[model samples]
Target chain A: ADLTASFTVTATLVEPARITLTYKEGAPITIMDNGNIDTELLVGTLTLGGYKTGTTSTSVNFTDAAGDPMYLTFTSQDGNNHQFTTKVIGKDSRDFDISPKVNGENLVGDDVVLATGSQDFFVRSIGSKGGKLAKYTDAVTVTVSNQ
Target chain B: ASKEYGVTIGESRIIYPLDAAGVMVSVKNTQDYPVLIQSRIYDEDPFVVTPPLFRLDAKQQNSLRIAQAGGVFPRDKESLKWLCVKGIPPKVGVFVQFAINNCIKLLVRPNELKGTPIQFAENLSWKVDGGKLIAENPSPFYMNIGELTFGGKSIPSHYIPPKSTWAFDLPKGLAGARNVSWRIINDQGGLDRLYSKNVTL
Candidate 1:
């Protein structure tokens, strides 16, 4: 006869959070894959609305989720097969104290008390940046964790 | 750190494009103390490294050649292997000392195929059967899944035999799964996007 004792660990971490981001009016935003563009690619509405436990401020950051930040990228075939660096921007829905935030910026963390917030953002594809030649098909994670 | 920590590798890894015959990797020892290095291939065939063992003078460098010896591998896609280089200290040990080694990835790409390694990722198939998750690889090329998940829990990457299936044990007490996510190695020596979807029994 044999005996086994196993226990399951569930909900040990905070409740999972979700993000809802859609292009202007739910229209598909398409921008040139070129890296040398001065104009912004496209702007859309972004909101982090989810439930979490604890009274600590919920901080959120971005990750490539390729498991590495070195490979955070976007690609396209816009003439001459191009790849571009993705610059995620976070700004206030209206005029706020902060103008806007760009890559490597903490969009919502210390400033956020509740687990819900909304903002506007525009993503760019910088050609000069190192990227690969392929259609970019990956989710950019706006991580929300209790810091 | 090992006494030979100064030993440096020229390339992060080795890549053999179809047009190229082999790769030349530079190994340099910048320490004042002399060093000995033994390079060997691990779990791979048709790939050879020159100078099975060699010694380097203080602050000296040498190039190691990795050549393909010809084997029956996939041409439509790429294959992966590894090369382990062991660095030995000059001091004779009174007690058994640990050896310092570095492993680098060896990639073989066939030029005959016009598509890149990232394109072949679509050939993978996934399904759920009898409380088990299975990944079916239909291509001749080896598919490396860097990460996989079952019901939000990690499912260690398993070797899915070429043109065969790889099954993973589902979480206990599971009739359905919330979702499955995965990340796979792509060509250009980078991890590709995370592919995920909700699953139901």
Candidate 2:
């Protein structure tokens, strides 16, 4: 019997890993002289699709869980009333094009086409009115979809 | 090395003959677990996938049928569609799960085309006008450009479909240079031999 002829199939277990996103490394957090904090950190690798033709052209977007603008606030770990505001910057390892609008808020990349390789991601932070920044960690969701 | 998916597709790109009733796509679950495989056509309504959702047992294989819906594509050229297959894992624990959706190109080829895709790609017409390089594909196949260079400067890869033209800005220094070279991607997703041609201004 042809398998494609019918839509019925017996129940079975379903387990597969389609995409893998791993953390590579990140730079040390530091505050710069001009009353601001700016640094670039190597985020991780995004592996998608197969090794044959790679992946199709897909759109990549960055967002936070609270639906707020792309901003990373580093709170003082030393129990001080000091806080620093920094906007996240996303740059693809292949294109290396920086986001041009909204302080890199809700940025969508439409030209990401890659094969099954290590597609690295880098994030840079830029903002003003910085006094002291402590060590902080947070999570941001990176969404990838077909364009 | 990159990690491999438990489910594997048979072909890198699917070529559908116009005379055939439908195209069959081979899918396999390589691991020792079952998977719920879902197939669909993306952004295209003229194509349909049968057994849109199914379950594949451990080390099992199946085929999906891709048939055309009630629509007429251009007979003189090839039409493109995306066949996307995704594998869904069972929710066993409270951990973040990553799902990968694999999509591949499905090219519908008419029977009347004469030459191969490589020949058509190498024979593409080129011209320079208004400080831009124009590439025109007069064949019935899509030109998968691997590398394109104008006066020895590399440009980004592009997909120039049949009966279409793509233009790129020529740098001011190399505007007058007539040397143009390019490499096309083969059916196996590898780069073919480079072809060079000179264009008239």
Candidate 3:
């Protein structure tokens, strides 16, 4: 006789999400020279990147919604246009690590699991194409989800 | 550090193995005021959150389950992913209206493979080429570089796949290319206290 007792444990995940750069209250993000310039976001741990012609500074703070471990990454979504020859940091692609440190380690790629729920780091502004330029705007979005 | 506002993640790292049912994490909003919380997970290489949207209130305490994504991964070694948790505060004005995000590591380990990866992590071959730092992994197991430092400043994070090589470019020519140091994830999934240094160009 083959008898087995099994029960289904079914459940669904329900969570709301939000990402806002916070309206511009201060001066535009600027890079004085070769190094990166930091801009503090009104919200908790957001650092707006500022840098030379070809680059932009980058960094942020965060936590998993339910305190569950999460995998993270970024998407440029659109290419840097409007004669902005250079990209933020060194690479011009969407696959760059925003958080440089997790548990005080180099967060180069997207494989890091942050149990602390927060990250504070810096991004190279890659330098600039032209010396003088107007304020530039671009959107670099990050994703938090089940890996 | 003064944590006047923010959400605190429960664990320092999340290691996922193929054999296990799954892993869980704890999250709590440490902010003084109420805030909207959102969470998502990605397989690897910076992807989108799985659910259309999953919102949780910080006031409550619970455990959240973490599982692998639909993407395929090599069973012989290790796979990686990122979990992005975004926090948004209400627009109450001058003192409020901001956003916080926590991106953590979601490591996927192979069930079939055995042996502590930490022991073999030290068997690495490194060099400097054309302003790019190259790390070669000759071992059978994948290596997660917790920290990399050259010319005094720490470089971005990266993973060195098994039997593969990863090249990290320097912002400028490494004047101090003569010496380099780094910390690798040991067997217990923590940073090695000692630095693997003297990696000559």
Candidate 4:
């Protein structure tokens, strides 16, 4: 003779809230003379679910949504086209790491992985190919994902 | 977090075997919506990533294949590179769509390496030369210094490439002190055991 007892077990599964990137539109980002433009000058903040222990990782990629070869193409206030080669540098709010450099230069178009849940990114002008520098307006697309 | 809507990568660091044709990285989309995934090697000179771009439906998973393209790597030591993967959400309207990129360290290892990565890390040579604290990596493995301290003052963390040397300025008051300690970053992107040594000045 065998005695068997069965009990119903029910568990509720909750989906974590989706990560959100709030575009903080501020003053336009201005890159001048190979210097770095602070992130505080343009766009808005990106809020993640915050850092948690485990294998989960996240990264941010900055690309030109307009499909411009150069990250951004701006028209000077003087009515001349100006193209500047640029790169986005990010600093982890938690001070995890700085991006690697190649050939003594932080190469452009390299993606930044935020070890912490948050990061601040800025643009740097490396090489410019077109006309005189003046006030310009353009938009750069930022993409965030969990890797 | 429970059941987060994002992509998950299988490994923190990639170890590519020299004998194998290519290394496969597993990437899974955990979101309930479709995502556009793109993978690329930072410096395209030495490696090639297949299917540079693709799309994944909700809960879909795929692997990015990475293979050596060209350029000669040292046979005695491991070579390091960067792999970048971007996950882009589908555009719904004129609003800015969010996307994220994941960058991971990739190491190409030769088949003839003699010992484990830890052993290579443990055997790092430290000394003080010309008033500078010098750390030398004689093995073929890259050493990720999580934390390095001399005379109890912290120095900047950095990577010591195979058969390479890194030097730091000795702390002003601790010139005579020989106590030095360091921690290595493991494959899981965490610090390994602490190592301390009384180095030769």
Q: lDDT by residue for model 1 over B15-105, one digit each (tens)?
A: 6775466778877665576778788776645777888799988777888888887777677666667666655656500111223344455
TM-score, B chain alone, candidates in order: 0.71, 0.78, 0.74, 0.77
Please report the candidate that would top DockQ against the real structure.
Answer: 4
Instruction: Kindly list the per-residue Cα lDDT of model 3 for residues A41-86, writing each as its tens digit.
Output: 2222333221111111223322222221221211122353222221
Please, what are the lDDT tens digits per residue for candidate 1 over residues A1-147? 998999986642211122222333223344436424333444233433322221112233445434433223443424553444444444432333221222235333223223224444444433435533333333444433211
Q: What's the ranking of the predictions by lDDT, best on top? A: 2, 4, 1, 3
The per-residue C-alpha lDDT of model 3 at residue A19 equals: 21
Note the Cα lDDT for every prediction shown.
Answer: 0.51, 0.58, 0.47, 0.58
Q: Please give, for residues B63-169, the per-residue lDDT of candidate 2 as tens digits.
A: 99998766677788988877777766554000123334555667888887777798777788789887778999887898877678888876545667898888875
Off by over 4 Å in 3: A1-147, B1-5, B45-60, B68-72, B91-96, B140-142, B151-153, B171-176, B186-189, B197-201
For candidate 2, the TM-score is 0.62
In model 1, what are the clashing residue pairs, if there are any? A35-A127
TM-score of 1: 0.46
* Model 2: TM-score for chain B: 0.78
Alpha carbon lDDT of residue B1, candidate 4? Answer: 10
Off by over 4 Å in 2: A1-116, A122-147, B1-7, B29-34, B57-61, B92-96, B129-132, B169-177
lDDT of 4 by residue, A53-95 (tens): 2212223335553454424333334455454444444554345
Clash number by candidate, in order: 1, 2, 39, 8
Per-residue lDDT of A128 in model 1: 37
TM-score of each prediction: 0.46, 0.62, 0.53, 0.59
Which candidate model has the greater DockQ, 1 or 2?
Answer: 2
lDDT of 2 by residue, A55-79 (tens): 3333334443334455544444355
What interface RMSD do all candidates show, one decimal each? 25.4, 10.0, 11.6, 10.4
Error of 1 at A106 (Å): 42
